[PDB]
Amino acid sequence: GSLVPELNEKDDDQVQKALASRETQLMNRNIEITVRDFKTLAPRRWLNDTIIEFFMKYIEKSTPNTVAFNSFFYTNLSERGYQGVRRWMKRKKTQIDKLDKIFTPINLNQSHWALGIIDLKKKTIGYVDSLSNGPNAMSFAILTDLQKYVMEESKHTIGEDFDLIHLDCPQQPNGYDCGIYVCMNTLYGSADAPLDFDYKDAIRMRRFIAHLILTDALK
Structure with a gap:
């Protein structure tokens, strides 16, 4: 189709x-x-x-059972940690344990747009880039932050064992x-x-x- x-x-x-x-x-x-x-x-x-x-x-x-954050989500998470985005989920009228996925659009260096995908059911966090040179420092950081986010948001019930991947x-x-x-x-x-x-x-x-x-x- x-x-x-x-x-x-x-x-x-x-x-x-x-x-x-x-x-x-x-x-x-x-x-x-x-x-x-x-x-x-x-x-x-x-x-x-x-x-x-x-x-x-x-x-x-x-x-269903999906949250797609705006691009300012990651900017705040990055510069201010979890504390800088700690109400963002609650504002979505849901809980992280009740979701299938979480999408995070990422504006790198104000030009390059990329995507983070947290798949709670698959237990993965993917970094998806359409102009990818391969793994790099920034992608690593993105994955690390998104994981941190999951670990915090969930009051440390989930996320510590997720596969941190680079999705083609x-x-x-x-x-x-x-x-x-x-x-x-x-x-x-x-x-x-x-x-x-x-x-x-x-x-x-x-x-x-x-x-x-x-x-x-x-x-």
Whole structure:
């Protein structure tokens, strides 16, 4: 089958409109998306925090027993430890012991977008990068932090024995589609699907998110 649909002509045009539009509110559901933000979905552009946040919340609402944190989660966890993110789970109206997965979009050095996947059932923490040179210091750190997070959040009941892995995923053909690939990996991860997508699937993602935004998908 396929996880990212092809838009019908009316839906793809609505997107086109909004992209060529000069308009301060396409959406407000607590994520306000503007044409300015929307335009980062436009082709060849760097996807911004707001659009990731949107997609993440979409995934949450469209996936049982799943939490998909925004990109500021990892920044706070990294700079301030667990104490800097200790209420974030409670705010999700759930408990960590009651989840299948936890997604964490990661903005490395403000440009490079990557993905952390905590799979509580599989007992793994994966680092997924679409511009991967291989294991490195930052990926190691990400895995270590996410593990620490699990260990704390769970009041030290789970996480200490998790497999800390580097998950292969499809590699982007350019230096700007990181955001999209993160979204792609999140969607697939959420469906427990192998990360076997291609670049054509990825470009369709841009239109899809755009569609989702314009159709008030979070509602």
